[PDB]
UniProtKB/Swiss-Prot annotation:
Entry protein name: DNA-directed RNA polymerase II subunit RPB1
Record function comment: DNA-dependent RNA polymerase catalyzes the transcription of DNA into RNA using the four ribonucleoside triphosphates as substrates. Largest and catalytic component of RNA polymerase II which synthesizes mRNA precursors and many functional non-coding RNAs. Forms the polymerase active center together with the second largest subunit. Pol II is the central component of the basal RNA polymerase II transcription machinery. It is composed of mobile elements that move relative to each other.
Any further remark recorded for this protein: The binding of ribonucleoside triphosphate to the RNA polymerase II transcribing complex probably involves a two-step mechanism. The initial binding seems to occur at the entry (E) site and involves a magnesium ion temporarily coordinated by three conserved aspartate residues of the two largest RNA Pol II subunits. The ribonucleoside triphosphate is transferred by a rotation to the nucleotide addition (A) site for pairing with the template DNA. The catalytic A site involves three conserved aspartate residues of the RNA Pol II largest subunit which permanently coordinate a second magnesium ion.
Comment, domains: The C-terminal domain (CTD) serves as a platform for assembly of factors that regulate transcription initiation, elongation, termination and mRNA processing.
Quaternary structure and interacting proteins, as annotated: Component of the RNA polymerase II (Pol II) complex consisting of 12 subunits.
Post-translational modification: The tandem 7 residues repeats in the C-terminal domain (CTD) can be highly phosphorylated. The phosphorylation activates Pol II. Phosphorylation occurs mainly at residues 'Ser-2' and 'Ser-5' of the heptapeptide repeat. The phosphorylation state is believed to result from the balanced action of site-specific CTD kinases and phosphatase, and a 'CTD code' that specifies the position of Pol II within the transcription cycle has been proposed.
Subcellular location: Nucleus
Family listed: Belongs to the RNA polymerase beta' chain family.
Length: 49
DNA sequence: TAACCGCCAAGGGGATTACTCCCTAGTCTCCAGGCACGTGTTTTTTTTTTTTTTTTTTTTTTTTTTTTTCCTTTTTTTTTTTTTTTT
C-alpha cells in the first residue's frame, strides 16, 4: 500500500494498476497529469501563458 | 484273381588275381596373404544466433471565445452521554 500511494503520487495513469480514489468520484490528478496534456503546465502554462 | 511256391532255364556283372602307374605323403625352403593392432571420417547431438510473426504497450486526437448548473460525500461502526429501573 505504501508503494501504491507512492505510485499514485507519481503516476495515476498506469494501466494494470488500481486507480486512486478521490472524494468526489474522480481519479487523482498526479504530477504527470499536471505536466503532460494540452492544458498542462508545459503546453497550457509555459507554452501558452 | 494273381500272390506265392516250385521248378526249370538263361545270362549278366561283381568278386578275385595280377600288372601297372601316377598322384599324393612326406620333407625342405622361400615368400606372401591372413591377421593383430591402430585409427578414421561420416553421423548424430547440441548449441547459437537469427527470423518471423504475434502480442502488448503507449500515445495521440486544430485553436480561440461566451453563458449556465451540480457538486465541492456518506453510510457504518464506535463512543459517550442520558434516562430508567431496582434494592
Amino acid at each position: 500500500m505504501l508503494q501504491f500511494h507512492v505510485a499514485t503520487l507519481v503516476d495515476n495513469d498506469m494501466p494494470g494498476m488500481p486507480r486512486a480514489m478521490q472524494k468526489s468520484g474522480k481519479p487523482l490528478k498526479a504530477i504527470k497529469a499536471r505536466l503532460k496534456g494540452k492544458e498542462g503546465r508545459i503546453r497550457g502554462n509555459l507554452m501558452g501563458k
